[PDB]
Amino acid sequence: HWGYGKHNGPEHWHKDFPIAKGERQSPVDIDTHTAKYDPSLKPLSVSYDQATSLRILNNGHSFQVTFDDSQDKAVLKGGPLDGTYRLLQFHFHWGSLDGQGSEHTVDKKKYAAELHLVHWNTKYGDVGKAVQQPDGLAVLGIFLKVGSAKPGLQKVVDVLDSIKTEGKSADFTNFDPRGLLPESLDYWTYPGSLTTPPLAECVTWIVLKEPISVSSEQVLKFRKLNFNGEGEPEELMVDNWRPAQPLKNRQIKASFK
Numbered sequence: 001h002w003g004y005g006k007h008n009g010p011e012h013w014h015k016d017f018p019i020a021k022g023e024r025q026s027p028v029d030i031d032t033h034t035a036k037y038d039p040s041l042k043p044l045s046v047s048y049d050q051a052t053s054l055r056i057l058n059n060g061h062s063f064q065v066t067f068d069d070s071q072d073k074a075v076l077k078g079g080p081l082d083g084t085y086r087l088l089q090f091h092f093h094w095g096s097l098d099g100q101g102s103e104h105t106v107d108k109k110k111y112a113a114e115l116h117l118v119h120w121n122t123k124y125g126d127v128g129k130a131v132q133q134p135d136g137l138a139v140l141g142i143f144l145k146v147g148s149a150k151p152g153l154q155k156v157v158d159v160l161d162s163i164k165t166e167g168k169s170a171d172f173t174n175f176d177p178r179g180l181l182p183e184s185l186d187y188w189t190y191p192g193s194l195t196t197p198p199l200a201e202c203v204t205w206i207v208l209k210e211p212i213s214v215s216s217e218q219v220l221k222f223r224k225l226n227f228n229g230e231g232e233p234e235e236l237m238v239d240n241w242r243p244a245q246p247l248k249n250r251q252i253k254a255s256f257k
């Protein structure tokens with residue numbers, strides 16, 4: 001069973017998921033001087049006004065907020081994408097201390113955490129079919145730095161005590177993911193993969209340039225979660241990030257100059 005530890009972490013994943021050593025793996029370091037501005041890229045369209053959150057879940061690798069994706073209610077379009085991508089869930093990756101936790105890096109800089117909003121292409125009908133396609137998923141990645149609190153995150157932080165251990169879930173209705181977005185939608189994009197098993201090469205990554213700020217108290221609550229199930233030896237859910245992978249033959253494009 002895969003995880004983030006010494007004996008089951010990212011360096012081991014290739015044994016069960018040989019695509020881990022593939023040609024389009026994520027995350028990557030974003031070298032800002034090498035990314036080329038592409039004036040043909042569109043502004044990203046984020047349409048979250050009718051989002052319907054359902055549940056919050058500790059899945060043993062992160063916590064996630066899940067949405068109703070049975071209609072086009074919370075969709076990502078434009079940017080580098082062709083067609084319409086439905087929001088399925090968001091989750092986070094974070095560190096044991098504020099100097100690590102992000103998956104993507106920017107000129108080798110690591111952020112305290114990274115938010116991923118996972119969307120799937122409606123042309124494939126369901127997420128399981130979408131993960132088998134090179135353009136099946138679009139993940140919107142947002143960096144978190146520690147400073148001022150993010151008010152729109154607090155509803156999330158306040159229920160984490162109720163999902164401490166793997167398999168726990170709770171009702172989480174009426175959560176508005178617009179409250180997690182930075183001002184600017186300027187972004188980098190590149191073709192990549194899921195950053196957890198099965199590591200499928202199905203993702204168009206859209207990584208926002210502008211981080212959000214969260215407070216030390218907010219991130220400390222992330223770090224009280226447990227990788228373990230209830231009753232098992234307590235292992236803080238921290239450092240649940242895959243390191244940067246080889247860029248290989250890929251170009252990172254910037255939406256901005």
Ligand SMILES: [N]S(=O)(=O)[C][C][C]C1234B567B189B21%10B32%11B543B645B786B917B%1021B3%114C6571[C][C][C]S([N])(=O)=O
Nearest residue numbers: 116118127128129131139193194195196198
């Ligand atoms: N039919 S199926 O089980 O392959 C569908 C998998 C859907 C997933 B998988 B689960 B669902 B979707 B895909 B990966 B893991 B959970 B979500 B992405 C998941 C976790 C985040 C991967 S990341 N960090 O690249 O956003």
Ligand SMILES: [Zn+2]
Nearest residue numbers: 091093116195
């Ligand atoms: Zn993720």
